[PDB]
Design an enzyme around this catalytic site. Sequence first.
Site, PDB file in Angstrom:
ATOM      1  N   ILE A  37     -40.602 -24.713  43.339  1.00  0.00           N
ATOM      2  CA  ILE A  37     -39.553 -23.649  43.297  1.00  0.00           C
ATOM      3  C   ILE A  37     -38.177 -24.306  43.143  1.00  0.00           C
ATOM      4  O   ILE A  37     -37.324 -23.719  42.449  1.00  0.00           O
ATOM      5  CB  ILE A  37     -39.620 -22.737  44.539  1.00  0.00           C
ATOM      6  N   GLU A  74     -35.493 -28.088  44.611  1.00  0.00           N
ATOM      7  CA  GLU A  74     -34.940 -28.955  45.686  1.00  0.00           C
ATOM      8  C   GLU A  74     -34.404 -28.068  46.815  1.00  0.00           C
ATOM      9  O   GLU A  74     -33.544 -27.210  46.537  1.00  0.00           O
ATOM     10  CB  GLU A  74     -33.827 -29.848  45.137  1.00  0.00           C
ATOM     11  N   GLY A  75     -34.903 -28.275  48.037  1.00  0.00           N
ATOM     12  CA  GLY A  75     -34.414 -27.605  49.256  1.00  0.00           C
ATOM     13  C   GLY A  75     -33.893 -28.616  50.261  1.00  0.00           C
ATOM     14  O   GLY A  75     -34.234 -29.807  50.127  1.00  0.00           O
ATOM     15  N   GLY A  76     -33.091 -28.159  51.226  1.00  0.00           N
ATOM     16  CA  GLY A  76     -32.587 -28.987  52.338  1.00  0.00           C
ATOM     17  C   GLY A  76     -33.723 -29.531  53.186  1.00  0.00           C
ATOM     18  O   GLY A  76     -34.409 -28.723  53.844  1.00  0.00           O
ATOM     19  N   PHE A  77     -33.918 -30.854  53.165  1.00  0.00           N
ATOM     20  CA  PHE A  77     -34.814 -31.603  54.087  1.00  0.00           C
ATOM     21  C   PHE A  77     -36.249 -31.601  53.550  1.00  0.00           C
ATOM     22  O   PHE A  77     -37.182 -31.832  54.346  1.00  0.00           O
ATOM     23  CB  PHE A  77     -34.721 -31.007  55.494  1.00  0.00           C
ATOM     24  N   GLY A  78     -36.421 -31.354  52.246  1.00  0.00           N
ATOM     25  CA  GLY A  78     -37.698 -31.573  51.539  1.00  0.00           C
ATOM     26  C   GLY A  78     -37.868 -30.666  50.323  1.00  0.00           C
ATOM     27  O   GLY A  78     -37.131 -29.698  50.148  1.00  0.00           O
ATOM     28  N   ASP A  82     -23.711 -26.879  55.218  1.00  0.00           N
ATOM     29  CA  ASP A  82     -23.909 -27.046  53.752  1.00  0.00           C
ATOM     30  C   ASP A  82     -23.975 -25.682  53.057  1.00  0.00           C
ATOM     31  O   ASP A  82     -24.905 -25.468  52.257  1.00  0.00           O
ATOM     32  CB  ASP A  82     -25.159 -27.867  53.424  1.00  0.00           C
TER      33      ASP A  82
END
Length: 273
Positions: A22, A24-28, A134
């Site tokens: 889906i 790039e997300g925060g922390f993985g 963020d």
Amino acid sequence: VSIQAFTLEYIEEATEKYKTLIGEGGFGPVYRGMLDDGQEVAVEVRSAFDNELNLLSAIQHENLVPLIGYCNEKDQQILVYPFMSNGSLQNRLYGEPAKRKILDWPTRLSIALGAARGLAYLHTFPGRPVIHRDIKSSNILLDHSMCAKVADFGTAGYLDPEYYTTQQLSEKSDVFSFGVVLLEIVSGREPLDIKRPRNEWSLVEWAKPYIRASKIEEIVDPGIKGGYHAEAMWRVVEVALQCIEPFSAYRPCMDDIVRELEDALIIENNASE
Ligand SMILES: C[As](C)(=O)[O-]
Ligand SMILES: [Ca+2]
């Protein structure tokens, strides 16, 4: 409303072996899946906790991406959220889809009020605050009904300038960041773009003059030119300016922002009917 534990086997069935990514997300990384009951999910896999799950379990608001469940098995840390079918505010403002459909002013306004309410819930959380740190248009997601869902509350152009003094991010740093988001919503421009003329590199630096000089029409997204009522636009631009004050001391609280954004939407809804 209640958090579930999933097995790796179930996450793999739902995710079809991480076939779709889906984004790039925060922390993985975050992969697309469907549960066996049919609801579409986003599955975050930590790149490299139980207190975090309890915090995420304790967060409940219509304008925050809710936690469905998680996977604990074999020293993995997986988080499962609803899939937000209308994507990111960033993408709908100046993304690929923006070339197809122009997000209208009242909807933009409604998305901003939603996002502010989400952040307000986090900032005024009982006992200790939850600080995002963020905030950006890419972290304001949209469901089927275009209801704002703030993500990644577990970036250059958004960073509190005062951070260079304090080396700390606070509620007031979230507020500055959100001010930049309000500028995106008004202008339809991404905060930083080198390809723009030199005077237009920073959305924030470019905009302030025109707002200061009461010439907002120059900074407004062409797609919503003559699509807003001046009284409503003034409110958003004015509060946006207060948010991006270099000194946090003059910056409103998120809840003052909620009220200004509510006022703007009542003005539009009043003139609309
Ligand atoms: C991060 As908290 C739930 O102790 O305010
Ligand atoms: Ca409150």
